[PDB]
Design a protein around this nucleic acid. Structure first.
Ligand SMILES: O=c1ccn([C@@H]2O[C@H](COP(=O)(O)O)[C@@H](O)[C@H]2O)c(=O)[nH]1
Ligand SMILES: O=c1ccn([C@@H]2O[C@H](COP(=O)(O)O)[C@@H](O)[C@H]2O)c(=O)[nH]1
Ligand SMILES: O=c1ccn([C@@H]2O[C@H](COP(=O)(O)O)[C@@H](O)[C@H]2O)c(=O)[nH]1
Ligand SMILES: O=c1ccn([C@@H]2O[C@H](COP(=O)(O)O)[C@@H](O)[C@H]2O)c(=O)[nH]1
Ligand SMILES: O=c1ccn([C@@H]2O[C@H](COP(=O)(O)O)[C@@H](O)[C@H]2O)c(=O)[nH]1
Ligand SMILES: O=c1ccn([C@@H]2O[C@H](COP(=O)(O)O)[C@@H](O)[C@H]2O)c(=O)[nH]1
Ligand SMILES: O=c1ccn([C@@H]2O[C@H](COP(=O)(O)O)[C@@H](O)[C@H]2O)c(=O)[nH]1
Lengths: 147, 147, 147, 147, 147, 147, 147
RNA sequence: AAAAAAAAAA
RNA sequence: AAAAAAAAAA
RNA sequence: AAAAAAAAAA
RNA sequence: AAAAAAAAAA
RNA sequence: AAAAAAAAAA
RNA sequence: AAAAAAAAAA
RNA sequence: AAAAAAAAAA
RNA sequence: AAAAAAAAAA
RNA sequence: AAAAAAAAAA
RNA sequence: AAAAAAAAAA
RNA sequence: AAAAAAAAAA
RNA sequence: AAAAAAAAAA
RNA sequence: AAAAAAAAAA
RNA sequence: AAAAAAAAAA
């Protein structure tokens, strides 16, 4: 009931309720991946299941959106860039969403949203997307629903 | 943005956001304890941290309310009863909140709410409350905030 | 139902209700302490648990406010004064709330309120506050919640 | 003053107030009595004064209402029943308020209210009412004012 | 009364008021801590009591919020980052609030607020939080109430 | 943000703010001075800087108002009286604000306000005012701004 | 013109104005007189002209009202009293306005107002009123217009 | 707030 | 009147 | 309620 | 009329 | 009151 | 929100 | 827009 | 603007 | 503010 | 007209 | 009409 | 709330 | 519907 | 919501 109350008070409990010891969880997971120049890196869904994110008890996840930022400085004379290519078990996309920095000292960023019709579960062996960048590390923040 | 959209679309990401790989979680945890006749059982807070509830990564928890139900049938000729005595590190209470069944085939239940001023963190070695019952098992559902 | 009724009437009782034989109690407890000149006296919480106040069955108490009055006359030529320094298990305060009389024949008084965030339980061995006065006895009235 | 305040604040206390170290207390007292078949049991008021209810410091009580429930199962083939006959020092009543269960596995219950004109004090040696039941134990919940 | 008045004017003083020579004080305290790479640094509450902040007369403090900024440049090729893990005497948290810079020449920052239920006093020997950063110095600004 | 919140939450800190480790402080300082019969006592500003008031870190103060009360009983047959003469570095005043008691057992009191045009800083060697009284001690409460 | 202005500004003065180096002054003059038991004391107007009141440059005064208070304690067992009999150069009054204390430790007081038709000037040799009291000193506060 | 004395004003 | 603790209610 | 000092905010 | 200083007031 | 120059501001 | 290209509609 | 300093005005 | 701490008020 | 996941409610 | 994809905008 | 005791009710 | 029985009423 | 935790937004 | 007991208040 909120408060103003300074002592323990009785709750008039009823019948035993429906319960669930292992619920779902909506999250924004931050992690980094190492990228090599001119080579696409396939980001594994397995990266989302870890004690470091309190998610090692889940075996599936529904990804809703993916955002990426360059995480280290770009090569001399260049502006940072990052590209994302969505991957799906039913058929990979060929879109190459790209963000470029406008100040050499700033991160490049881009993201993409997955439509409802493509929001099925993915497991550790599946891949989320392909990342390309002129920077050696890319930081991702993935919005998803663990279940 | 919701949908009607059937394909992946670009998100115009900005600067890197504030992140947290290990967030807090509000939960209703269900577990059972074995009770002996005429003896109070002290419920340990440690029972709330377990891979069975996806909470083994937490070391502290703020308890908000406790509800209890008898979980096995009572002795012959009796109606089930359950009593709860709140325990606190700064000083134990002597209240004995009690619920009794009105049908011998039904569970007895009772609960108590912890006021805001007493909502500090508790760790595995601390106890939540004392349970007394004429039934050999009591089912608890604890509402709490893992942090 | 109040009355106008002059005879016993039936109550159509239902199921057995939630009960508690040992409830909480909000009180204003009056007691006196002996004080020596130039020496602070630490007021023990144990003073609040006594058959003299019908509170010997409690082992914890949540203090909400403390008010103090000088209880004997001050030394010749002086006006009475009383100072209160709040004490807390998590860290003592250094505030010295003080009241002085404006008529030599009148009591000096002062009090302090404990904020919600500091209203945790205290037990017999804990201290409430430090009292200083030029009078040999101080009368305290403590508002608290026994639980 | 409630709060939002996170520190101790001064109270501008006035004159010494009217006090009372031993106040009255309005309560709902739960206790059980053993009953034999076909014999009325006179419930003593003395049962209300006990350290088990935090009321051993009182010597008088004003009873406002009495509710009773069967507390053990009835004899084979029967439905539980409980009857209450009000007793008063100025003259006993002959009313036999009765409740019967409609499911053999459920408690029978009934109660009666004492009108204002009959609410005088009672002491340990006085009796509250007579209880009759086909069950060996009856649970009573008495609403009263200890003074 | 404000003014327009150019000379001293009389105040019709009444009775001696309630006084307090040592009041509480709400403050925003700025200080820096040295951090080593890959090692968490526990920030002591003792850092808040110092003649440099006019707070050496206090022995307790209630912390309300903590904000941190990187104070020196990050290692070559990296963007600054700072993480804060709240610590509490009743149980430490495992949250790792983190801020990262989006321009290599800019400070990274993050903060956290302590809820009312966890705002108890802390003393010199207690710790406020754990700080982690890729920068050798972190600047903190702590909002608190000295008492 | 106030609350209802029971756990630590993230603050999205921005740029490093303007800070000040040694702020100003508005206060009401209570202290006593010894006075001899028929002799004026010059109250030094130095009395306001002391660890006893948490103000030993300040070297200047702007006085806003001065109130004085007799602090010991007057000579036999007399009513207490107190006079205040304002002093200023740019030129002393010759006003003698005076308060007299109307009951021999009560304190005499008077005060004066300093206008805005005369509110400049004063240091330890400066004097605030001259006090005269038939009582051996005078209690002053000075409202000022330490800076 | 008041201000907000921080520098000296020009005043466009006109013709030389009407001036007066020695103006009138409305005042409340406080002074004490010694009284003997059972003897009336005639208060001289000359008492109002003194360097102690900044009025030694005046030779006349128009008295508007006279208030008197006992200034020392009364004889043992008695309550203080003070009587005032108005005196006038055109004819003395026989009214004996009297005030008595209702607490032995408190001053007795009374006053009288002079009507417009009797407000002519008085000089040093004239008397204001006759004072009678059981106290050895009487304090007067006279409202007048020096001219 | 209203008045009177000294000062000030569009 | 508004709150909190105990009791009571259509 | 209005102000000032310290803190906080959409 | 509005202000400030001294005085006065229901 | 309206303007211009210097200063100041939510 | 308004437009244009591809798709869709009562 | 409001203020202050210098200038200007029916 | 709203709050809290210190100060101030008809 | 509106939504979804976990918690809470008259 | 309303939607979705690509483009455009104060 | 309003109340109290016994009975009755959508 | 409406009724009936016993009681009560301006 | 209102709240709190995680996520999302013009 | 209304009451009573304990506590609190402009
Ligand atoms: N009230 C009960 O107390 C618990 C927490 O209440 P509160 O935190 O919303 O006040 C749960 C709610 O049903
Ligand atoms: N749009 C972006 O797509 C993600 C999920 O959107 P939706 O699930 O709310 O439509 C995130 C949001 O900012
Ligand atoms: N009526 C019942 O009678 C008891 C006291 O009623 P009263 O004192 O409020 O009239 C209890 C209430 O439920
Ligand atoms: N304020 C004082 O503080 C105490 C508790 O206040 P609160 O609990 O109602 O805020 C008492 C009250 O007079
Ligand atoms: N007037 C008195 O003068 C002092 C300061 O007043 P001011 O600074 O608010 O004008 C104090 C107040 O009670
Ligand atoms: N919210 C942040 O939390 C701190 C304290 O908030 P609260 O005490 O006003 O709720 C600071 C404020 O910006
Ligand atoms: N302006 C002139 O300045 C002096 C004082 O003004 P002020 O104190 O009323 O602002 C005089 C007035 O005519």
């Amino acid at each position: 009931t909120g408060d103003n109350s300074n002592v323990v008070t009785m709750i008039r409990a009823g019948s035993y309720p429906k319960v669930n010891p292992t619920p779902t969880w909506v999250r924004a997971i931050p992690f980094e991946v190492s990228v090599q120049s001119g080579i696409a890196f396939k980001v594994p869904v397995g990266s989302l299941f870890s004690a470091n994110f309190r998610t090692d008890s889940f075996t599936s996840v529904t990804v809703m959106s993916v955002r990426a930022w360059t995480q280290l400085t770009p090569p001399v004379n260049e502006y940072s860039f990052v590209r994302l290519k969505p991957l799906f078990k039913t058929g990979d996309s060929t879109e190459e969403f790209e963000g470029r920095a406008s100040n050499i000292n700033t991160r490049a960023s881009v993201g993409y949203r997955i439509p409802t019709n493509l929001r099925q579960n993915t497991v550790a062996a599946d891949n989320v997307c392909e990342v390309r960048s002129n920077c050696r590390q890319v930081a991702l923040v993935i919005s998803c629903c663990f279940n």
